[PDB]
């Protein structure tokens, strides 16, 4: 189906403790494949997935040079932000950037992204047209005018439409056995008495990829979202994901509750009940 590539930058000043740190990670769909950390002894863009290791030394040397220069750029951007917001040198501040491309089943670009934040709030974003910007405040409008004057959006449109799509299609091919292979969740319902009159029903989904999933509890076919505790989808550590949903039910009503699991790796949605035997 659809796929995406994303890079995430975090630049963080640490006044009085050290130079500003710069961390970059790259993802194809829900799979991280590269990382860079300016705090490392030898800062290098490094592989984080098996299918990216086959890239030659020119790729890794080029990615490392880019990440080192990007780190210097965002160290300077942190100083500029202090100017725009009239903030002191004493405080620690954070710039975050995420950018990348979404492609459809045809490998055609669906949407490009280039979003920046300052201290965890929207700062400036490339619009869907890949030619204009949206600034969140008057400080970011200063940056916007500079980027309009320097024709920055044209350069990012060229990347998002070209190299982003081309490299993603190539990463998808090199890692086809995992990236284009959907693992359905393995599911079961557990039962945990709270008292002699109440019990928790927990519906589990384990070992699935990609992370998108829908878990819902129904009682006599009626959705129980308001009474369902739904944990965040969480990484298992082996590039698969887990999730559960739980409801507190009165003792004796357990068999009227059904868990419904929707995942693209499934031939069709599941319906689960507590299976005491």
């Amino acid at each position: 189906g659809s796929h995406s590539m994303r890079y995430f930058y975090t630049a963080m000043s640490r006044p009085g403790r050290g130079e500003p740190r710069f961390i970059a990670v790259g993802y194809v769909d829900d799979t991280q494949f590269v990382r860079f950390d300016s705090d490392a002894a030898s800062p290098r863009m490094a592989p984080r997935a098996p299918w990216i290791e086959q890239e030659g030394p020119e790729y890794w040397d080029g990615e490392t040079r880019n990440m080192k220069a990007s780190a210097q750029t965002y160290r300077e951007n942190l100083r500029i932000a202090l100017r725009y917001y009239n903030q002191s040198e004493a405080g620690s501040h954070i710039i975050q950037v995420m950018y990348g491309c979404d492609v459809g089943p045809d490998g055609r670009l669906l949407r490009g992204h280039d979003q920046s934040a300052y201290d965890g709030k929207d700062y400036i974003a490339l619009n869907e047209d890949l030619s204009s910007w949206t600034a969140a405040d008057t400080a970011a409008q200063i940056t916007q005018r500079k980027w309009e004057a320097a024709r920055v959006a044209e350069q990012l449109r060229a990347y998002l439409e070209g190299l982003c799509v081309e490299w993603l299609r190539r990463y998808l091919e090199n890692g086809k056995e995992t990236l284009q292979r959907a693992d359905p969740p393995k599911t079961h319902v557990t039962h945990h008495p709270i008292s002699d009159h109440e019990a928790t029903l927990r519906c589990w989904a384990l070992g699935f990829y990609p992370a998108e999933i829908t878990l819902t509890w129904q009682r006599d076919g009626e959705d129980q979202t308001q009474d369902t505790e739904l944990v965040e989808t969480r990484p298992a550590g082996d590039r698969t994901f887990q999730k559960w949903a739980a409801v507190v039910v009165p003792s004796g009503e357990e068999q009227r509750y059904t868990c419904h699991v929707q995942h693209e790796g499934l031939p069709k949605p599941l319906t689960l009940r507590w299976e005491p035997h």
């Binding site: 880019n66 320097a150 990347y159």
Partner: peptide
Amino acid sequence: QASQEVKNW
């Protein structure tokens, strides 16, 4: 592959 376009604020 990461974008190489420089973003000066």
